[PDB]
Amino acid sequence: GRLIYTAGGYFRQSLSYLEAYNPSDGTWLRLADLQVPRSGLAGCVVGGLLYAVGGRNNTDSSALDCYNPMTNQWSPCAPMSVPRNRIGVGVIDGHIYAVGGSHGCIHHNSVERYEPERDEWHLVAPMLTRRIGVGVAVLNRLLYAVGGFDGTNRLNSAECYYPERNEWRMITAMNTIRSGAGVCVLHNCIYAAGGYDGQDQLNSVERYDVETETWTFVAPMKHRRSALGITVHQGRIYVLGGYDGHTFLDSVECYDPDTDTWSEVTRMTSGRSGVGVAVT
Ligand SMILES: CCN1CCN(CC(=O)Nc2ccc(S(=O)(=O)N(CC(N)=O)c3ccc(N(CC(N)=O)S(=O)(=O)c4ccc(OC)cc4)c4ccccc34)cc2)CC1
């Protein structure tokens, strides 16, 4: 079936593991290592290929790498215009948007679009706010950028990028300050799980309802975590690993909306934070 893929991460050092999880049977698979270990990166899928974007290696990375699940092989792509650690990523119409992130102490508000048909990156309109450790979600061909750190403030704001118009507009702020949160879209809402509010790692979780332009809380996860991996598979949310203030988790929790519950459904081969994640 489809698999949940987790690339890179951090446990004492930057990692190059690429493992895949099969929710239809609880199995883990070991795939080809990343050529350079990275954490703080994001994953996404376009046309069957997995992409590892940005992060920080063993200095901050502008790398974009493609993984073919059919050949079990990694291949370099065109690099981004700038290094982007703690990057968020979305896909619109087969094009990868790289949002925010950091290069040393520069906190990006810039955004660039990658086209796989050309192996080219191009800058689009910059966000209204600099954000590293920013969650990114794509709903209704709109790209949403949620939380993060702007270099001075941890943020609870969120903005919205309009591709046809090439512009950003703020939207309603979350109830909670969140950097390094997990953000995805499940059943036409934006979900923001976990994060770091400035003093603690969070386990709260709020979804945004576009119509009501409201953020409302939902059942919190069992393990407070930041810098977690997140994805959606067969109508549920999966959060993977992360840091809870003391430990690098190996926990994988699964949110079911209909029942509004978080189950623990497996554990990673080892505990880690700062993984990129995708499903294909
Ligand atoms: C310098 C002194 N010191 C401090 C800590 N320490 C132990 C340690 O370092 N743990 C540790 C914890 C995570 C990693 S990581 O996942 O790999 N990584 C760096 C990467 N790119 O690899 C990242 C760090 C911080 C982030 N956040 C946003 C943001 N802008 O900071 S955050 O989640 O909100 C946060 C977490 C923790 C926190 O402290 C509680 C505050 C905010 C990230 C967000 C998204 C993706 C990666 C992030 C690596 C080591 C050793 C030494």
Side-chain angles (χ1 to χ4, degrees), residues 9-14 38-41 55-57 60 85-87 102 107 132-134 148-150 154 178-181 195-201 225-228 242-245 248 272-275:
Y10 182 95
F11 172 85
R12 312 275 150 260
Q13 42 175 349
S14 279
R38 298 185 268 157
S39 61
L41 74 171
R56 189 232 280 145
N57 47 36
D60 292 333
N85 187 26
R86 295 148 188 193
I87 177 168
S102 57
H107 303 78
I132 79 175
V134 48
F149 181 61
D150 76 359
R154 229 148 295 270
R178 298 193 191 265
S179 49
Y196 185 70
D197 75 3
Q199 224 81 13
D200 315 281
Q201 270 75 12
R225 55 184 88 210
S226 75
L228 60 140
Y243 187 73
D244 71 354
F248 292 97
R272 67 195 71 158
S273 189
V275 296

Side-chain angles (χ1 to χ4, degrees), residues 244-257:
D244 71 354
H246 304 275
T247 317
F248 292 97
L249 312 186
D250 64 3
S251 170
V252 174
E253 296 180 55
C254 179
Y255 173 77
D256 184 341

Side-chain angles (χ1 to χ4, degrees), residues 3-226:
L3 300 166
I4 300 175
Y5 288 89
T6 169
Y10 182 95
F11 172 85
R12 312 275 150 260
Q13 42 175 349
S14 279
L15 304 174
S16 47
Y17 306 138
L18 170 66
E19 292 154 354
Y21 177 80
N22 184 351
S24 147
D25 74 356
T27 323
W28 282 92
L29 287 49
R30 180 79 186 266
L31 310 178
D33 281 354
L34 265 180
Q35 302 173 99
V36 176
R38 298 185 268 157
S39 61
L41 74 171
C44 62
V45 181
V46 183
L49 308 155
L50 188 70
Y51 290 90
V53 200
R56 189 232 280 145
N57 47 36
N58 272 339
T59 71
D60 292 333
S61 168
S62 65
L64 165 74
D65 289 289
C66 189
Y67 170 86
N68 201 336
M70 295 303 298
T71 78
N72 188 32
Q73 167 143 76
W74 281 100
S75 321
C77 297
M80 306 180 286
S81 70
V82 291
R84 295 187 185 271
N85 187 26
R86 295 148 188 193
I87 177 168
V89 158
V91 187
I92 321 182
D93 294 343
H95 294 142
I96 305 165
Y97 288 73
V99 188
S102 57
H103 177 195
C105 297
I106 295 158
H107 303 78
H108 300 303
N109 70 311
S110 70
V111 188
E112 39 198 300
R113 207 182 60 124
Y114 176 75
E115 312 170 8
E117 64 265 55
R118 305 208 164 71
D119 195 38
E120 289 184 357
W121 286 92
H122 301 282
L123 296 172
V124 297
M127 293 185 293
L128 302 156
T129 314
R130 313 179 185 264
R131 312 171 179 268
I132 79 175
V134 48
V136 179
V138 169
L139 178 59
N140 289 305
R141 270 203 65 189
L142 294 197
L143 174 84
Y144 290 80
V146 180
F149 181 61
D150 76 359
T152 297
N153 313 303
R154 229 148 295 270
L155 307 166
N156 69 312
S157 60
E159 32 190 311
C160 188
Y161 173 72
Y162 294 76
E164 218 70 13
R165 270 165 264 234
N166 191 24
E167 68 174 41
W168 290 86
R169 325 197 198 161
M170 301 283 329
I171 71 177
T172 307
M174 288 172 300
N175 289 280
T176 319
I177 291 191
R178 298 193 191 265
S179 49
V183 185
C184 59
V185 297
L186 166 65
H187 295 160
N188 208 63
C189 308
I190 300 179
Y191 279 83
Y196 185 70
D197 75 3
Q199 224 81 13
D200 315 281
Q201 270 75 12
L202 305 159
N203 66 39
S204 64
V205 169
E206 30 182 327
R207 68 161 167 64
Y208 175 82
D209 173 314
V210 282
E211 303 173 45
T212 57
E213 306 146 12
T214 314
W215 292 92
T216 86
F217 283 96
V218 306
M221 308 169 291
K222 180 191 132 164
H223 287 304
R224 63 184 63 263
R225 55 184 88 210
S226 75

